[PDB]
Amino acid sequence: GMSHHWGYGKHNGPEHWHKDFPIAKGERQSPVDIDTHTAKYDPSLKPLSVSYDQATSLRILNNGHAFNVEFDDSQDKAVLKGGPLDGTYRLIQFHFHWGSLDGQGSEHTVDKKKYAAELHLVHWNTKYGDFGKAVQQPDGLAVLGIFLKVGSAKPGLQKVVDVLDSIKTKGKSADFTNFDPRGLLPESLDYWTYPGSLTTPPLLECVTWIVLKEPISVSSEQVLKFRKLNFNGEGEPEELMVDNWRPAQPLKNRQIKASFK
Ligand SMILES: C[C@@H](Sc1nc(-c2ccc(Cl)cc2)c(C#N)c(=O)[nH]1)C(=O)Nc1ccc(S(N)(=O)=O)cc1
Ligand SMILES: [Zn+2]
Secondary structure, eight states: OTTOOOOSSTTTSTTTGGGTOGGGGSSSOSOOEEOTTTSEEOTTOOOEEEEOTTOOEEEEEEOSSSEEEEEOOSSSSSEEEETTOOSOEEEEEEEEEEOSSTTOOOSSEETTBOOSEEEEEEEEEGGGSSHHHHTTSTTSEEEEEEEEEESSOOGGGHHHHHHGGGGOSTTOEEEOOSOOGGGGOOSOOOEEEEEEOOSSTTOOSOEEEEEESSOEEEOHHHHHHHTTOBSSOTTSOOOBOOOOOOOOOOOOSOOOEESOO
Protein backbone atom coordinates (compact mmCIF):
# COMPACT_ATOMS: atom_id res chain seq x y z
CA GLY A 1 0.00 0.00 0.00
CA MET A 2 3.02 2.28 -0.39
CA SER A 3 1.16 4.02 -3.23
CA HIS A 4 -2.32 4.27 -1.64
CA HIS A 5 -3.50 7.89 -1.54
CA TRP A 6 -7.08 7.37 -0.36
CA GLY A 7 -8.36 9.19 2.70
CA TYR A 8 -11.42 11.03 3.97
CA GLY A 9 -10.81 14.42 2.40
CA LYS A 10 -12.82 16.13 -0.33
CA HIS A 11 -10.41 14.94 -3.02
CA ASN A 12 -9.59 11.41 -1.84
CA GLY A 13 -12.65 10.48 0.23
CA PRO A 14 -15.25 7.67 -0.03
CA GLU A 15 -16.72 8.97 -3.31
CA HIS A 16 -13.29 8.56 -4.92
CA TRP A 17 -12.33 5.11 -3.67
CA HIS A 18 -13.92 3.18 -6.52
CA LYS A 19 -11.32 4.45 -8.99
CA ASP A 20 -8.49 2.55 -7.29
CA PHE A 21 -10.73 -0.05 -5.60
CA PRO A 22 -13.58 -0.96 -7.98
CA ILE A 23 -15.01 -3.37 -5.41
CA ALA A 24 -16.27 -0.19 -3.71
CA LYS A 25 -19.40 -0.59 -5.85
CA GLY A 26 -19.59 -4.33 -5.11
CA GLU A 27 -22.43 -6.58 -3.97
CA ARG A 28 -21.71 -6.77 -0.24
CA GLN A 29 -20.15 -3.47 0.81
CA SER A 30 -20.12 -1.99 4.31
CA PRO A 31 -21.24 -0.13 6.29
CA VAL A 32 -25.01 -0.19 5.80
CA ASP A 33 -28.03 1.38 7.42
CA ILE A 34 -29.72 -1.03 9.80
CA ASP A 35 -33.47 -0.73 9.34
CA THR A 36 -34.68 -2.23 12.63
CA HIS A 37 -38.18 -2.86 11.34
CA THR A 38 -36.89 -4.80 8.31
CA ALA A 39 -34.25 -6.88 10.10
CA LYS A 40 -35.68 -10.31 10.85
CA TYR A 41 -35.28 -12.20 14.11
CA ASP A 42 -33.47 -15.48 13.48
CA PRO A 43 -34.14 -17.94 16.35
CA SER A 44 -31.47 -20.26 14.95
CA LEU A 45 -28.76 -17.68 15.68
CA LYS A 46 -26.70 -18.88 18.65
CA PRO A 47 -25.64 -16.62 21.50
CA LEU A 48 -22.43 -14.77 20.79
CA SER A 49 -19.35 -16.05 22.62
CA VAL A 50 -16.79 -13.39 23.49
CA SER A 51 -13.79 -14.85 25.31
CA TYR A 52 -11.33 -12.03 26.01
CA ASP A 53 -10.02 -13.17 29.40
CA GLN A 54 -6.58 -14.10 28.03
CA ALA A 55 -6.27 -11.15 25.63
CA THR A 56 -2.75 -9.81 25.18
CA SER A 57 -2.60 -6.25 23.86
CA LEU A 58 0.79 -5.15 22.58
CA ARG A 59 0.83 -1.76 20.93
CA ILE A 60 -1.28 1.20 19.81
CA LEU A 61 -0.64 2.72 16.39
CA ASN A 62 -1.77 5.85 14.55
CA ASN A 63 -1.89 4.58 10.95
CA GLY A 64 -3.01 7.82 9.30
CA HIS A 65 -6.68 6.71 9.08
CA ALA A 66 -7.46 5.77 12.71
CA PHE A 67 -5.54 4.27 15.65
CA ASN A 68 -5.30 0.52 16.19
CA VAL A 69 -4.76 -1.26 19.48
CA GLU A 70 -3.07 -4.50 18.38
CA PHE A 71 -3.10 -7.91 20.08
CA ASP A 72 -1.01 -11.06 20.04
CA ASP A 73 -2.98 -13.36 17.73
CA SER A 74 -0.38 -16.13 17.40
CA GLN A 75 -2.51 -18.31 19.73
CA ASP A 76 -6.19 -18.58 20.70
CA LYS A 77 -6.07 -15.98 23.49
CA ALA A 78 -8.98 -13.66 22.69
CA VAL A 79 -11.61 -15.17 20.45
CA LEU A 80 -15.10 -14.63 19.14
CA LYS A 81 -17.33 -17.64 18.42
CA GLY A 82 -21.00 -18.49 18.15
CA GLY A 83 -23.63 -16.12 16.84
CA PRO A 84 -23.73 -16.56 13.02
CA LEU A 85 -20.17 -17.86 13.05
CA ASP A 86 -18.82 -21.35 12.63
CA GLY A 87 -15.29 -21.82 13.84
CA THR A 88 -12.99 -19.67 15.93
CA TYR A 89 -12.09 -16.07 15.13
CA ARG A 90 -9.07 -14.44 16.82
CA LEU A 91 -8.94 -10.80 17.87
CA ILE A 92 -6.13 -9.05 16.03
CA GLN A 93 -6.91 -5.38 16.62
CA PHE A 94 -9.58 -2.83 17.42
CA HIS A 95 -10.04 0.79 16.32
CA PHE A 96 -12.72 3.44 16.09
CA HIS A 97 -14.30 5.75 13.51
CA TRP A 98 -15.60 9.07 14.87
CA GLY A 99 -16.86 12.45 13.80
CA SER A 100 -16.08 16.14 14.12
CA LEU A 101 -19.42 16.55 15.93
CA ASP A 102 -21.30 14.27 18.36
CA GLY A 103 -24.12 13.89 15.81
CA GLN A 104 -22.00 11.91 13.36
CA GLY A 105 -19.10 9.50 13.32
CA SER A 106 -20.46 5.96 13.16
CA GLU A 107 -20.24 3.95 9.95
CA HIS A 108 -23.32 1.82 10.45
CA THR A 109 -26.51 3.73 11.20
CA VAL A 110 -29.70 2.50 12.89
CA ASP A 111 -32.87 3.67 11.17
CA LYS A 112 -30.63 6.36 9.64
CA LYS A 113 -29.44 7.49 13.08
CA LYS A 114 -25.72 8.28 13.28
CA TYR A 115 -23.81 7.74 16.53
CA ALA A 116 -20.81 9.76 17.73
CA ALA A 117 -18.39 6.95 16.96
CA GLU A 118 -18.15 3.22 16.32
CA LEU A 119 -15.74 0.67 17.75
CA HIS A 120 -14.59 -2.20 15.53
CA LEU A 121 -13.08 -5.31 17.16
CA VAL A 122 -11.49 -7.17 14.26
CA HIS A 123 -11.17 -10.99 14.32
CA TRP A 124 -9.97 -13.48 11.69
CA ASN A 125 -11.04 -17.09 11.03
CA THR A 126 -8.30 -19.38 12.34
CA LYS A 127 -8.99 -22.01 9.68
CA TYR A 128 -7.16 -19.71 7.25
CA GLY A 129 -3.91 -19.62 9.23
CA ASP A 130 -3.18 -15.90 9.12
CA PHE A 131 -4.94 -12.58 8.68
CA GLY A 132 -3.51 -12.01 5.21
CA LYS A 133 -5.07 -15.26 3.96
CA ALA A 134 -8.31 -14.62 5.82
CA VAL A 135 -9.10 -11.29 4.12
CA GLN A 136 -9.15 -13.16 0.80
CA GLN A 137 -12.03 -15.39 1.97
CA PRO A 138 -15.78 -14.60 2.09
CA ASP A 139 -15.92 -15.77 5.71
CA GLY A 140 -12.40 -14.73 6.67
CA LEU A 141 -13.20 -11.98 9.15
CA ALA A 142 -15.73 -11.23 11.88
CA VAL A 143 -15.90 -7.61 13.02
CA LEU A 144 -17.81 -6.82 16.20
CA GLY A 145 -19.15 -3.29 15.92
CA ILE A 146 -20.20 -1.23 18.94
CA PHE A 147 -21.79 2.21 18.80
CA LEU A 148 -20.59 5.03 21.05
CA LYS A 149 -22.88 7.81 22.22
CA VAL A 150 -21.80 10.82 24.27
CA GLY A 151 -22.97 10.88 27.88
CA SER A 152 -21.28 9.32 30.89
CA ALA A 153 -17.61 8.34 30.66
CA LYS A 154 -16.56 4.77 29.84
CA PRO A 155 -13.97 3.90 32.52
CA GLY A 156 -12.52 1.08 30.47
CA LEU A 157 -11.73 3.47 27.63
CA GLN A 158 -9.66 5.96 29.61
CA LYS A 159 -6.36 4.10 29.27
CA VAL A 160 -6.79 4.43 25.50
CA VAL A 161 -7.64 8.13 25.77
CA ASP A 162 -4.61 8.89 27.92
CA VAL A 163 -2.06 7.36 25.55
CA LEU A 164 -3.22 9.26 22.46
CA ASP A 165 -0.84 12.13 23.26
CA SER A 166 2.05 9.82 22.40
CA ILE A 167 0.71 8.78 18.96
CA LYS A 168 -0.61 12.11 17.71
CA THR A 169 0.63 11.76 14.15
CA LYS A 170 0.69 9.17 11.37
CA GLY A 171 3.22 6.39 11.86
CA LYS A 172 3.65 6.87 15.59
CA SER A 173 3.17 3.90 17.91
CA ALA A 174 3.46 3.21 21.64
CA ASP A 175 3.69 0.13 23.84
CA PHE A 176 0.17 -0.69 25.02
CA THR A 177 0.23 -3.86 27.05
CA ASN A 178 -2.26 -5.30 29.50
CA PHE A 179 -5.27 -3.47 28.13
CA ASP A 180 -8.53 -5.37 28.75
CA PRO A 181 -10.95 -5.06 25.83
CA ARG A 182 -13.79 -6.40 27.99
CA GLY A 183 -14.00 -2.92 29.45
CA LEU A 184 -15.34 -1.61 26.13
CA LEU A 185 -18.38 -3.89 25.92
CA PRO A 186 -22.00 -2.94 26.69
CA GLU A 187 -24.08 -5.08 29.08
CA SER A 188 -26.14 -6.83 26.41
CA LEU A 189 -24.75 -8.87 23.53
CA ASP A 190 -27.94 -8.64 21.42
CA TYR A 191 -26.88 -8.01 17.83
CA TRP A 192 -27.69 -7.62 14.13
CA THR A 193 -25.62 -9.54 11.57
CA TYR A 194 -25.06 -9.42 7.81
CA PRO A 195 -22.35 -10.31 5.27
CA GLY A 196 -20.22 -7.32 4.31
CA SER A 197 -16.79 -5.86 3.73
CA LEU A 198 -13.88 -3.93 5.17
CA THR A 199 -15.06 -0.32 5.39
CA THR A 200 -11.76 1.16 4.14
CA PRO A 201 -9.66 0.27 1.10
CA PRO A 202 -9.03 -2.49 0.01
CA LEU A 203 -12.76 -2.84 0.84
CA LEU A 204 -12.48 -6.64 0.60
CA GLU A 205 -15.76 -8.53 0.95
CA CYS A 206 -14.50 -10.86 3.64
CA VAL A 207 -16.46 -9.78 6.72
CA THR A 208 -19.31 -11.22 8.73
CA TRP A 209 -20.54 -8.11 10.53
CA ILE A 210 -21.92 -8.43 14.05
CA VAL A 211 -23.22 -5.08 15.30
CA LEU A 212 -24.36 -4.79 18.91
CA LYS A 213 -27.74 -3.22 19.57
CA GLU A 214 -26.68 -1.57 22.84
CA PRO A 215 -24.24 1.33 22.46
CA ILE A 216 -21.73 2.23 25.15
CA SER A 217 -21.54 5.78 26.50
CA VAL A 218 -18.32 7.82 26.51
CA SER A 219 -17.82 11.33 27.84
CA SER A 220 -17.48 14.47 25.76
CA GLU A 221 -13.91 14.79 27.07
CA GLN A 222 -13.07 11.27 25.93
CA VAL A 223 -14.28 11.73 22.34
CA LEU A 224 -12.79 15.25 22.28
CA LYS A 225 -9.35 13.69 22.71
CA PHE A 226 -9.95 11.41 19.72
CA ARG A 227 -10.51 14.57 17.69
CA LYS A 228 -7.08 15.93 18.61
CA LEU A 229 -5.28 13.18 16.73
CA ASN A 230 -3.74 13.95 13.31
CA PHE A 231 -4.15 12.29 9.88
CA ASN A 232 -0.80 13.82 8.92
CA GLY A 233 2.67 12.76 9.93
CA GLU A 234 4.85 14.84 12.23
CA GLY A 235 6.34 17.96 10.67
CA GLU A 236 3.50 18.26 8.15
CA PRO A 237 0.52 20.66 8.14
CA GLU A 238 -1.93 19.62 10.82
CA GLU A 239 -5.11 17.95 9.63
CA LEU A 240 -7.28 16.83 12.54
CA MET A 241 -8.25 13.17 12.45
CA VAL A 242 -12.04 13.54 12.42
CA ASP A 243 -14.86 12.15 10.30
CA ASN A 244 -12.86 9.06 9.32
CA TRP A 245 -16.06 7.16 8.57
CA ARG A 246 -17.50 5.73 5.37
CA PRO A 247 -21.21 6.47 4.79
CA ALA A 248 -23.85 3.76 4.49
CA GLN A 249 -23.70 1.72 1.26
CA PRO A 250 -26.52 0.02 -0.73
CA LEU A 251 -27.82 -3.12 1.01
CA LYS A 252 -28.56 -4.72 -2.37
CA ASN A 253 -29.27 -8.45 -2.13
CA ARG A 254 -28.76 -8.89 1.61
CA GLN A 255 -30.94 -9.40 4.67
CA ILE A 256 -29.90 -8.22 8.11
CA LYS A 257 -30.71 -10.78 10.81
CA ALA A 258 -31.37 -9.94 14.46
CA SER A 259 -30.46 -12.14 17.41
CA PHE A 260 -33.37 -10.72 19.42
CA LYS A 261 -37.11 -10.12 19.10
C1 LIG B 1 -4.21 -4.21 6.73
C2 LIG B 1 -5.59 -4.19 6.09
S1 LIG B 1 -5.85 -5.64 4.99
C3 LIG B 1 -4.42 -6.66 5.21
N1 LIG B 1 -3.77 -6.74 6.35
C4 LIG B 1 -2.69 -7.57 6.43
C5 LIG B 1 -2.02 -7.55 7.75
C6 LIG B 1 -1.93 -8.70 8.53
C7 LIG B 1 -1.39 -8.66 9.82
C8 LIG B 1 -0.95 -7.45 10.33
CL1 LIG B 1 -0.30 -7.38 11.93
C9 LIG B 1 -1.04 -6.30 9.58
C10 LIG B 1 -1.57 -6.35 8.29
C11 LIG B 1 -2.25 -8.32 5.38
C12 LIG B 1 -1.14 -9.18 5.60
N2 LIG B 1 -0.25 -9.88 5.78
C13 LIG B 1 -2.95 -8.23 4.12
O1 LIG B 1 -2.66 -8.88 3.11
N3 LIG B 1 -4.03 -7.37 4.12
C14 LIG B 1 -6.70 -4.19 7.14
O2 LIG B 1 -6.75 -5.02 8.02
N4 LIG B 1 -7.60 -3.19 6.99
C15 LIG B 1 -8.89 -3.09 7.55
C16 LIG B 1 -9.31 -3.78 8.68
C17 LIG B 1 -10.57 -3.57 9.20
C18 LIG B 1 -11.42 -2.67 8.59
S2 LIG B 1 -13.01 -2.37 9.28
N5 LIG B 1 -13.27 -0.80 9.37
O3 LIG B 1 -13.93 -2.91 8.33
O4 LIG B 1 -13.06 -2.94 10.59
C19 LIG B 1 -11.01 -1.98 7.47
C20 LIG B 1 -9.75 -2.18 6.94
ZN1 LIG C 1 -13.35 0.04 11.17
